[PDB]
Curated annotation (Swiss-Prot), chain A:
Classification via SUPFAM superfamilies: L35p-like
PROSITE patterns attached to this UniProt entry: RIBOSOMAL_L35
Keyword Membrane: no
UniProt cross-references to InterPro entries, sorted A to Z: Ribosomal_bL35, Ribosomal_bL35-like, Ribosomal_bL35_CS, Ribosomal_bL35_sf
Pfam families documented for this protein: Ribosomal_L35p
Protein name: Large ribosomal subunit protein bL35
Subunit structure: Part of the 50S ribosomal subunit. Contacts proteins L15 and L33.
Keywords: Ribonucleoprotein, Ribosomal protein, RNA-binding, rRNA-binding
GO cellular component terms given for this protein: cytosolic large ribosomal subunit
Source organism: Deinococcus radiodurans (strain ATCC 13939 / DSM 20539 / JCM 16871 / CCUG 27074 / LMG 4051 / NBRC 15346 / NCIMB 9279 / VKM B-1422 / R1)
Entries under NCBIfam families matching the protein: rpmI_bact
Gene Ontology MF terms: rRNA binding; structural constituent of ribosome
Gene Ontology terms describing biological process: translation
UniProtKB/Swiss-Prot annotation, chain C:
PANTHER family with a match to the protein in the record: 39S RIBOSOMAL PROTEIN L20
InterPro entries the record matches: Ribosomal_bL20, RIBOSOMAL_L20_CS, Ribosomal_protein_bL20_C
GO CC annotations on file: cytosolic large ribosomal subunit
Oligomer status and interactors: Part of the 50S ribosomal subunit. Contacts proteins L13 and L21.
Family according to the record: Belongs to the bacterial ribosomal protein bL20 family.
GO molecular function, one term: structural constituent of ribosome
Protein name from the UniProt record: Large ribosomal subunit protein bL20
Record key words, sorted: Ribonucleoprotein, Ribosomal protein, RNA-binding, rRNA-binding
Function: Binds directly to 23S rRNA, probably serving to organize its structure.
Organism encoding this protein: Deinococcus radiodurans (strain ATCC 13939 / DSM 20539 / JCM 16871 / CCUG 27074 / LMG 4051 / NBRC 15346 / NCIMB 9279 / VKM B-1422 / R1)
BP terms from Gene Ontology: ribosomal large subunit assembly; translation
UniProt feature coiled coil, ranges: none
Curated annotation (Swiss-Prot), chain D:
Function summary: Binds to the 23S rRNA.
Species: Deinococcus radiodurans (strain ATCC 13939 / DSM 20539 / JCM 16871 / CCUG 27074 / LMG 4051 / NBRC 15346 / NCIMB 9279 / VKM B-1422 / R1)
Designated name of the protein: Large ribosomal subunit protein uL15
Gene name in the database record: rplO
One GO biological process term: translation
Family statement: Belongs to the universal ribosomal protein uL15 family.
Curated annotation (Swiss-Prot), chain E:
Subunit structure: Part of the 50S ribosomal subunit. Contacts proteins L15 and L34.
UniProt entry tagged with the keyword RNA-binding: yes
Name the UniProt record assigns to this protein: Large ribosomal subunit protein uL4
Gene Ontology biological process terms in this record: translation
Origin species: Deinococcus radiodurans (strain ATCC 13939 / DSM 20539 / JCM 16871 / CCUG 27074 / LMG 4051 / NBRC 15346 / NCIMB 9279 / VKM B-1422 / R1)
Amino acid sequence: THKMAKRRIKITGTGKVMAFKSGKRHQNTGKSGDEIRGKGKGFVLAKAEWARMKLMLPR
Amino acid sequence: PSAGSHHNDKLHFKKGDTVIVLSGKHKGQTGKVLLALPRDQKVVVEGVNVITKNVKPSMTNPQGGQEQRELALHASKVALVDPETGKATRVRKQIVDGKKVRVAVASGKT
Amino acid sequence: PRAKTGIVRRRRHKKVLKRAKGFWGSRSKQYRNAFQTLLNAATYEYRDRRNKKRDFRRLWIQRINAGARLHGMNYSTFINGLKRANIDLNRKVLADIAAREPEAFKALVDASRNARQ
Amino acid sequence: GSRKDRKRVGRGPGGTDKTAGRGHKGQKSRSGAGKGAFFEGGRSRLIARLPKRGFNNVGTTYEVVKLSQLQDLEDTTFDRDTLEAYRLVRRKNRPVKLLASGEISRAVTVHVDAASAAAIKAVEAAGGRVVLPE
Amino acid sequence: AQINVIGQNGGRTIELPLPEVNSGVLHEVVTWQLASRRRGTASTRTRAQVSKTGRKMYGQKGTGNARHGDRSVPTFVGGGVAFGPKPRSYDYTLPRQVRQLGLAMAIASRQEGGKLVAVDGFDIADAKTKNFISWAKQNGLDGTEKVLLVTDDENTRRAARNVSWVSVLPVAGVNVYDILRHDRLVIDAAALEI
RNA sequence: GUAGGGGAGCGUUCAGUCCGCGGAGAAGCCAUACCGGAAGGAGUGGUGGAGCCGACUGAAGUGCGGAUGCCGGCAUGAGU
RNA sequence: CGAGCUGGAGAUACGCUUUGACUCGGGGAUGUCCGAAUGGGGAAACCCACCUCGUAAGAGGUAUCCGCAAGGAUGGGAACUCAGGGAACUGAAACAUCUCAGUACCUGAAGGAGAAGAAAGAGAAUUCGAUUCCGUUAGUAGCGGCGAGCGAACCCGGAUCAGCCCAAUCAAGCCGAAGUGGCUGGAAAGCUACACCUCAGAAGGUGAGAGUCCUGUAGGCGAACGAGAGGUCGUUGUUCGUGAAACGAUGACUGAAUCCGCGCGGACCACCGCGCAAGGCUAAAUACUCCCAGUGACCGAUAGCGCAUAGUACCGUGAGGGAAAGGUGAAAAGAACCCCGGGAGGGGAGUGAAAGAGAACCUGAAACCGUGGACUUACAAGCAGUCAUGGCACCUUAUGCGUGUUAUGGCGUGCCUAUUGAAGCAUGAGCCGGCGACUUAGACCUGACGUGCGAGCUUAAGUUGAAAAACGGAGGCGGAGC
Ligand SMILES: [K+]
Ligand SMILES: [Mg+2]
Ligand SMILES: [Mg+2]
Ligand SMILES: [Mg+2]
Ligand SMILES: [Mg+2]
Ligand SMILES: [Mg+2]
Ligand SMILES: [Mg+2]
Ligand SMILES: [Mg+2]
Ligand SMILES: [Mg+2]
Ligand SMILES: [Mg+2]
Ligand code: NA
């Protein structure tokens, strides 16, 4: 899907998922301190395969 | 079912040309050509003789017996031979009647 | 390039069918059944190889204790009588002796006693 | 000869056949017969549920011309904008960018479309002049 | 290093490929060629659609001992085929460089055995053919092994009627295949050569 | 040792190439106690009356016991 | 064209033919009735008229829609083209959008093609410059309950390439080089010893396997003469589903200018840039294929079109559905005559190489039935075997290794599937033969292996050549990431 090219799986030099954090951003929040300020990166070594098979070609 | 279509439906002889028989049976045996059929490539020559028996059940006095008749052949004949042996003839000319051509080999007698 | 299965199945089959020699009924004449018969047979041919030994050994044993009792002993005493002395180590074929040559087997019995008590 | 001509050893292995099994059954035992729409994508498995909106732009992508390509080897063929094609930078449709990576001071002239801070301060530092379009 | 028979006499020209002729290499080539010669032909009603057959048969439940739908499925006689032959092409493009190496090595195989060249085809004297064979005789070409002539020039081909003897090849039109098909080879023309 | 994965090969049709066989006779079928580790192959005989083995390589419409499979033929229920 | 012909048609009779029969080509002269059917009616192949020309026979006209007229049209076409109208199953692991898809189907119209076409364009270079098709761009931009999933264009290569005009050689066909003997055989074109042609060794026939016997093939010749505006509202297309949503199009309401003019350039405005509608026509590249030729790592008849001819038998009221079936032999010399019999059928004789080819005739498997012989069996309970031993019989892979058969003992819960678990009193199966199930396509993605280049690596379309192949570097992947 084209909603994948704009999904947090960028084709990095190596070939893994360039994730982020889905804890809480837009709604349902207001507690904790810097829980929302967790707008960093994320990575996984068990789904890189069944995710890159949809965006690999159009890197 | 084909039958003489392999050839072009043209016989290289007539119904009165002395012809010999090469290969098969009756080797070297010459005879006068009687009935010639360009379709089924059939050739009746007084040479090959076959004693057949006509079936006449009630023609009146059938007296069924074994008559003397001839049998037809295929392309196992060398038409027109003048050196006493099988020849071939494609050369052509004209005599007094330029409306018809002729045939020859190494001699010119057909 | 189509490829028929001609001449291939028949042969396959005849190969099986010809194995059936003494097979009763359709086992010897029909394939689906003759072939099926063999599977069970395979289970027999192999297991029988291993089992036949259990049969003959058993056979030889009866002859041995039959000839023993003939004099006044028994298989348990006789075989052991050859063990007490590393001398005799026959065991196999020994059954043939107690059957063809009773004289030769008589000495082995007497020797069993002289190395026991 | 033409009949002695063999094969690579491993140039092409035999196909795989699921018939004549003698103990072979194709696929999974159940719920796998003559259907192919399951896929391996969808949108209820990680695909969706990822917090990403971003913004697609794709403006101008410049051609990375490594500095060692100019320096090191070569007798200076004059980069210009045509002769450089033979220097293994054939791209077209996009402009040209000059980035410093190889280091061997040498005096060479450079005519690329655009160039970096460190690039320009590495060419004229050893001789040359980085020409940019007016 | 083959010396010309009619006209000049060199042969030192051209470089033969290393290693000394590899069978594998020619293999990939001949296969590709035969592959482009295989015409797409397939007379099979793979589809159950192309066949003239209705859509409904008996009933699904209650006919007793049936369970069928169309009489055009592969489980039925005179119907369609399962996975039949469909018309295709099978004509890829083998890498040019390797093709260039094909004949470069192909010729190679004849330089180590039967190799023959000639510039000047005057001995021929028109069609004749009879004289053509005479010329072969006086050149080792007895007429036992198959020969491939690869020269231009209309008359020169003109006289070449025979089977196991020689073969026609207009305008240096080589194959890896044709050269390996016949035994002896006659490059003759120095057009493609050198 | 099942699902499964891996490895080495047999057989069939078509094709290129090679050595060939065939009227004193091929293929096919039929009998068999030989051979190979299997798939299989060979010798001989009988039949038959025109074509077809082996080796290497390529290409699939390639290997049956089953699906209340399909087609055809022929049985049992019975002399009921 | 040069001897036969008298259709597929097996047979008889009468005949047609050097005043060139037939056949193969090319134009005419006759074409009943039905069918768009058109004189009317009509349940098609029937019935009934009238008028006119006339020796009665007989011939001609009489339909409707445009036109003074000439003339043209209402018809039928397998597929392909355009237009009008326009589904659902399915997908979305349900389902209202979207997909499916503007596909199938329906209808109208036309051709050997159509469609489209000479800028109120594309687009960003102050550029290309009719249309269509192919490759590429690229699966990018974009679209989408932002889900499924759908999906351009410009630049460039290539096929083919023109813009003019209104209103104010293929079909007949002929000619066409080059063998004799001997032997096996019933019959050779094979074996054998020699010879010859070859711009012809493609191929088929000829008793069998073929250059030189036949027809043809290379090549040459070849005719009377036959072809070649804007806006609003409701909506839609293009990637665009109402999103900031342009533009094109259309129904309904309204309604501008035209030279210091008008439209457009993803609301809008200025600037800038391109182009100038409300008229038309127009080769070629392109699609498909009833038909024809050629070809085949296409079948060889349970294949292949359904059909080795048949939309026939047969089924249904109808629409419609829809089979199976090949082979005597080189050629009929296909069986006089005799024996049994009503016949059928069979046996002799004869023909032939063969009758062990006999006309419900190539080969002749299996299931099934039967005859004969050998070895056995009428007190034992048997998944129908296996092992061992004995008796008997036979000795072509084989007098000594076993084969065939049996008596007896020991042992022994069909196969497949589906299952925690099957001999299962769970499922499937009368038997046998045949047919039958992991494939194919997309320069797709990824990996192993192999191979030719190697910091480079290849081309797609296409063109020119094809008993063979090269050319073609638009483009893609390497190369810098974030
Ligand atoms: K044999
Ligand atoms: Mg299953
Ligand atoms: Mg889920
Ligand atoms: Mg039942
Ligand atoms: Mg009763
Ligand atoms: Mg259609
Ligand atoms: Mg069991
Ligand atoms: Mg039971
Ligand atoms: Mg059961
Ligand atoms: Mg059940
Ligand atoms: Na229509």
